[PDB]
Amino acid sequence: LIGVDLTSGEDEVMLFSAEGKVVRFKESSVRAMGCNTTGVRGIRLGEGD
DNA sequence: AAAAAAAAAAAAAAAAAAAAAAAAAAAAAAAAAAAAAAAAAAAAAAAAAAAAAAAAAAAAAAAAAAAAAAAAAAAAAAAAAAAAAAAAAAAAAAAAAAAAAAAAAAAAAAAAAAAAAA
Numbered sequence: 282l283i284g285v286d287l288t289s290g291e292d293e294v295m296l297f298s299a300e301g302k303v304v305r306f307k308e309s310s311v312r313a314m315g316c317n318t319t320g321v322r323g324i325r326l327g328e329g330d
Numbered sequence: 331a332a333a334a335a336a337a338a339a340a341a342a343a344a345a346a347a348a349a350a351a352a353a354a355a356a357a358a359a360a361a362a363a364a365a366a367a368a369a370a371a372a373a374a375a376a377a378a379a380a381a382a383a384a385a386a387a388a389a390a391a392a393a394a395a396a397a398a399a400a401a402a403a404a405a406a407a408a409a410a411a412a413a414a415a416a417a418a419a420a421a422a423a424a425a426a427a428a429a430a431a432a433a434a435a436a437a438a439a440a441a442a443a444a445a446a447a448a
Contacts, residue, residue, distance in 0.1 A: 313375070318367080323376075 299327055 297305045305325055
């Protein structure tokens, strides 16, 4: 499913919150400007559940 | 031959419908822009991979915000009565293929008629 969707601008740092006690931060500018009906880019090597 | 029902006479009661003409709106059906979606090419950011590293969980231990106990008091929510909204179950139906009865064309042949020959 889709975890959550927020509307953001360039150079705004985004954080994740795993349900197995994890939190990460990657500048949003690192990742390429995606398009519709495409695949996805990995973010977090979240092992297990 | 008995019963029953239609129809027609004439003064009464009471209804219904088709078109023309112009100008505006409202349904309802089409081409045609316009953008999702999908197939098939090259192309390029991410995982891999490896070495190298140093930032946050352990551990000692005080102490300061805490969650249970006690009490008083306010009053949200739950279950029982009624009263509405909204959806499957079941039954019905109007066109619609199937069948049966009557109108128009057909010629074979003859009765009666009209006409003319010698």
